[PDB]
Design an enzyme around this catalytic site. Sequence first.
Site, PDB file in Angstrom:
ATOM      1  N   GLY A   1       1.003  -0.868  -0.156  1.00  0.00           N
ATOM      2  CA  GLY A   1      -0.038   0.085  -0.259  1.00  0.00           C
ATOM      3  C   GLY A   1       1.094   1.316  -0.151  1.00  0.00           C
ATOM      4  O   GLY A   1       0.617   2.494   0.074  1.00  0.00           O
TER       5      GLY A   1
ATOM      6  N   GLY B   1       2.949   2.364  -2.204  1.00  0.00           N
ATOM      7  CA  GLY B   1       3.076   3.464  -3.373  1.00  0.00           C
ATOM      8  C   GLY B   1       4.202   2.438  -4.409  1.00  0.00           C
ATOM      9  O   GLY B   1       4.494   2.796  -5.498  1.00  0.00           O
ATOM     10  N   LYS B   2       4.830   0.678  -4.665  1.00  0.00           N
ATOM     11  CA  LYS B   2       5.756   0.567  -5.308  1.00  0.00           C
ATOM     12  C   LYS B   2       4.932   0.066  -6.129  1.00  0.00           C
ATOM     13  O   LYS B   2       6.233   0.543  -7.297  1.00  0.00           O
ATOM     14  CB  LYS B   2       6.251  -1.442  -4.880  1.00  0.00           C
ATOM     15  N   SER B   3       4.159  -0.241  -7.341  1.00  0.00           N
ATOM     16  CA  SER B   3       3.217  -0.165  -8.114  1.00  0.00           C
ATOM     17  C   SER B   3       3.237   1.111  -8.446  1.00  0.00           C
ATOM     18  O   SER B   3       3.549   0.802  -9.705  1.00  0.00           O
ATOM     19  CB  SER B   3       2.069  -1.063  -8.035  1.00  0.00           C
ATOM     20  N   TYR B   4       2.300   1.998  -8.389  1.00  0.00           N
ATOM     21  CA  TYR B   4       2.268   2.953  -8.792  1.00  0.00           C
ATOM     22  C   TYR B   4       3.509   3.615  -9.267  1.00  0.00           C
ATOM     23  O   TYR B   4       3.337   4.470  -9.956  1.00  0.00           O
ATOM     24  CB  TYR B   4       1.274   4.189  -7.300  1.00  0.00           C
TER      25      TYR B   4
ATOM     26  N   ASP C   1       9.398  -4.890  -8.816  1.00  0.00           N
ATOM     27  CA  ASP C   1       9.035  -4.605  -7.901  1.00  0.00           C
ATOM     28  C   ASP C   1       8.401  -5.892  -7.040  1.00  0.00           C
ATOM     29  O   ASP C   1       8.471  -7.257  -6.650  1.00  0.00           O
ATOM     30  CB  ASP C   1       7.325  -4.180  -9.403  1.00  0.00           C
TER      31      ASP C   1
ATOM     32  N   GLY D   1       5.632  -7.200  -0.642  1.00  0.00           N
ATOM     33  CA  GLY D   1       5.302  -6.366   0.950  1.00  0.00           C
ATOM     34  C   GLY D   1       6.355  -6.587   1.890  1.00  0.00           C
ATOM     35  O   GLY D   1       6.550  -7.791   2.083  1.00  0.00           O
TER      36      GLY D   1
HETATM   37  N1  LIG Z   1       2.393   8.909  -4.653  1.00  0.00           N
HETATM   38  C1  LIG Z   1       1.156   8.408  -5.368  1.00  0.00           C
HETATM   39  N2  LIG Z   1       0.453   9.540  -5.280  1.00  0.00           N
HETATM   40  C2  LIG Z   1      -1.064   8.964  -5.432  1.00  0.00           C
HETATM   41  N3  LIG Z   1      -1.925   7.329  -5.426  1.00  0.00           N
HETATM   42  C3  LIG Z   1      -1.312   6.755  -4.905  1.00  0.00           C
HETATM   43  C4  LIG Z   1       0.698   6.983  -4.326  1.00  0.00           C
HETATM   44  N4  LIG Z   1       0.947   5.710  -4.627  1.00  0.00           N
HETATM   45  C5  LIG Z   1       0.163   4.649  -4.422  1.00  0.00           C
HETATM   46  N5  LIG Z   1      -0.906   5.690  -4.718  1.00  0.00           N
HETATM   47  C6  LIG Z   1      -1.916   5.001  -4.707  1.00  0.00           C
HETATM   48  O1  LIG Z   1      -2.158   3.934  -3.703  1.00  0.00           O
HETATM   49  C7  LIG Z   1      -2.557   2.451  -4.142  1.00  0.00           C
HETATM   50  C8  LIG Z   1      -2.293   1.675  -3.542  1.00  0.00           C
HETATM   51  O2  LIG Z   1      -0.574   1.821  -4.521  1.00  0.00           O
HETATM   52  P1  LIG Z   1       0.645   0.721  -4.321  1.00  0.00           P
HETATM   53  O3  LIG Z   1       1.543   0.992  -5.915  1.00  0.00           O
HETATM   54  O4  LIG Z   1      -0.629  -0.761  -5.517  1.00  0.00           O
HETATM   55  O5  LIG Z   1       1.402  -0.014  -3.509  1.00  0.00           O
HETATM   56  P2  LIG Z   1       2.406  -1.141  -2.897  1.00  0.00           P
HETATM   57  O6  LIG Z   1       2.007  -1.730  -4.825  1.00  0.00           O
HETATM   58  O7  LIG Z   1       3.327  -0.752  -2.812  1.00  0.00           O
HETATM   59  O8  LIG Z   1       0.895  -2.065  -2.856  1.00  0.00           O
HETATM   60  C9  LIG Z   1      -2.642   3.248  -5.488  1.00  0.00           C
HETATM   61  O9  LIG Z   1      -4.303   2.571  -6.076  1.00  0.00           O
HETATM   62  C10 LIG Z   1      -2.437   4.018  -5.606  1.00  0.00           C
HETATM   63  O10 LIG Z   1      -3.257   4.334  -6.968  1.00  0.00           O
HETATM   64 MG   LIG Z   2       1.489  -3.439  -5.495  1.00  0.00          MG
END
Ligand SMILES: Nc1ncnc2c1ncn2[C@@H]1O[C@H](COP(=O)(O)OP(=O)(O)O)[C@@H](O)[C@H]1O
Ligand SMILES: [Mg+2]
Lengths: 365, 365
Positions: free
Chosen positions: B101, B103-106, B248, B251
């Site tokens: 959660g 932001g790794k994938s984002y 990527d 967690g």
């Molecule tokens: N820097 C950012 N700005 C805006 N939205 C973000 C950002 N980072 C994450 N999010 C939102 O938060 C949610 C979770 O992020 P995600 O990249 O899936 O985290 P992870 O892959 O680390 O579990 C996603 O739906 C994404 O759109």
């Molecule tokens: Mg992810």
Amino acid sequence: DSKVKVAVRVRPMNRREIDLHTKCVVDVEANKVILNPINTNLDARGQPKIFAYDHCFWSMDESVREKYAGQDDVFKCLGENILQNAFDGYNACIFAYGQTGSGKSYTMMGTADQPGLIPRLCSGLFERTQKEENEEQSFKVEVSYMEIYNEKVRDLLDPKGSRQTLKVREHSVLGPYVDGLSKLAVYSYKDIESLMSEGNKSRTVAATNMNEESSRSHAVFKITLTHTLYDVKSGTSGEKVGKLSLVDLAGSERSNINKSLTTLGLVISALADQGAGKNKNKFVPYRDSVLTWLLKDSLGGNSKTAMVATVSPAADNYDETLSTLRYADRAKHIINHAVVNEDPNARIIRDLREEVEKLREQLTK
Amino acid sequence: DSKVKVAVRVRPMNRREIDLHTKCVVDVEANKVILNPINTNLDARGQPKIFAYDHCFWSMDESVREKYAGQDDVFKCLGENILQNAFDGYNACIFAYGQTGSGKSYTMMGTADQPGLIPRLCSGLFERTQKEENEEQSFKVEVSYMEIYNEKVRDLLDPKGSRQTLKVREHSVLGPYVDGLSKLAVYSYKDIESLMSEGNKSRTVAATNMNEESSRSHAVFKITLTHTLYDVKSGTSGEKVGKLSLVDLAGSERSNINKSLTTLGLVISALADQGAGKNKNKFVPYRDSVLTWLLKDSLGGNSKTAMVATVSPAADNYDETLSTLRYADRAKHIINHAVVNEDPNARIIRDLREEVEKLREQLTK
Ligand SMILES: Nc1ncnc2c1ncn2[C@@H]1O[C@H](COP(=O)(O)OP(=O)(O)O)[C@@H](O)[C@H]1O
Ligand SMILES: [Mg+2]
Ligand SMILES: Nc1ncnc2c1ncn2[C@@H]1O[C@H](COP(=O)(O)OP(=O)(O)O)[C@@H](O)[C@H]1O
Ligand SMILES: [Mg+2]
């Protein structure tokens, strides 16, 4: 290193010739083609003319089983050696030559019912790479498919379909090449089939309204086989590249719509002369047409090359058949200079290590 | 040759945190991250902790324009240098690290609305190859896209969709590799996008019913850039290969579902120690997990590597953030040994020619 290999293929009587009971003037006996006279009352010109070739394919009548050459017989006598040439790291070429309607396309590509040399070669190529890949060797396959018409080159694999013409250029490393021509990796038969298929429809969409002129176009299907050998105990590797060129020429019969075909006749004649030690100082006019330029290596250069001369057995085609038979005859005297295509640095290193040892023991004095 | 480059990215408060007015404990000032205490009454543990990094991306509020890092800011500070590393013939790696959660994938892939590092890198790669190809240089691009879950490797570009697992093997020439992994040529952005897209849907089809477990999987997107340089006045050519690995991770938060992540923590700690001259004789446990095995070169090997540590600014995530911030801190002491990946024969030949000249003038005596 080798002479151009020559096969002749005699197609069956077409439907008009069967209707009219047109007489057959072409006989095949082992590797001899006999062109019998049309005018049976002549003291020369009305005598049989006998030619000898490396291979003769009599394909006139499926029924005569002790004599008939089908598509797989062609492939086993010509395709398999060419596939083996590519796997050995030689450039290899097969081109089909002959009058319109004599069987060039049926032999190179064939029909959905009777696949020809190209789909059989493709299938066998991927069969062989699948069976031989392991930890000492890997393979990469690329394809190009082009058409030459009126001295202009088109890409039959073009994504757009503009049918725009491509510049042909010379390159000190690559040789003559088509600037912009798609060269696409393929990983299975079905990849290369989908490309074959799109290219064939672009040949036929080019023939919708211009049917008389589609008999004036050349098609070149080109597979690049990159063989990687892993020297696992030295932790090194190297590439051998073989290029397979399958060529479906324009119709050989009688502005510069025919410049390439004419130039090809000249190139064949000069190279045949040179093989027989005549006109040794006369340069071969490769450069005078797009086709002979692009395929200069296939004829008298770094290539193992076979010609399939295709002929009609019908009396009405006598003159065109004789001329096809004569070009094939000339072609079997062409000397090619095929070498294995690997990186030159290895030989340079071996020679330098030998020179180092020679110097080192000279120093002992 | 270089140290691992480290960036931290602070995501915005998510919807729950906004509902609850969850307090922000992460501040960014230039290249410093300040982790402020949650329990404001403590004499240690309730003090701010200050970390320094190569880059800090505050991405909390689009409105604050003098401070906010969007997707293209990330790409210009991290993506462009990595693309330039590949074009120079280095292996390059970016991996995203942090709790689920954060932001790794984002950051790596982003959303259709906010494309992340990978599509931006792809676009810039093909922009650059299109502008720089000419008669001295050509380019070939290949892509691989794999997922690691529970120490098993799957091919996200698989044509079938069986989701079968692939063996990981060691090779004296290739290094650790995935036996059977698709490696596909791409010729434009849209080729590599269609692969990106099929792989992303296979990541999400793998997450339909197993949503808690998809946070436990690693994804590796790999571009191979083969740069051919033509030595036109010597009639020769050569290849430089750069490999781009975008990672990527699973967690980072709290059977062998986490073997790779744990092993990665160990690998980072050992390499950081070694950079600071401790435990120099202790071998790094690359081999103990599939992920650290496959990416051994990216960490302390032949690679220019950047880490994006992603963190939540929310008080409830303090402990996971601290731990992410600490690993990033360790990571910036990892020494990498990136060399230009070209053919070794050229150096062998130069050295041998020099030895020949040395011997030749020794012989003059
Ligand atoms: N820097 C950012 N700005 C805006 N939205 C973000 C950002 N980072 C994450 N999010 C939102 O938060 C949610 C979770 O992020 P995600 O990249 O899936 O985290 P992870 O892959 O680390 O579990 C996603 O739906 C994404 O759109
Ligand atoms: Mg992810
Ligand atoms: N050896 C053969 N056996 C059976 N049919 C043939 C043979 N050669 C040619 N044909 C048929 O004759 C027609 C013309 O042959 P084609 O290969 O198009 O000649 P070209 O390409 O030389 O003009 C095709 O429809 C093909 O099916
Ligand atoms: Mg035809």
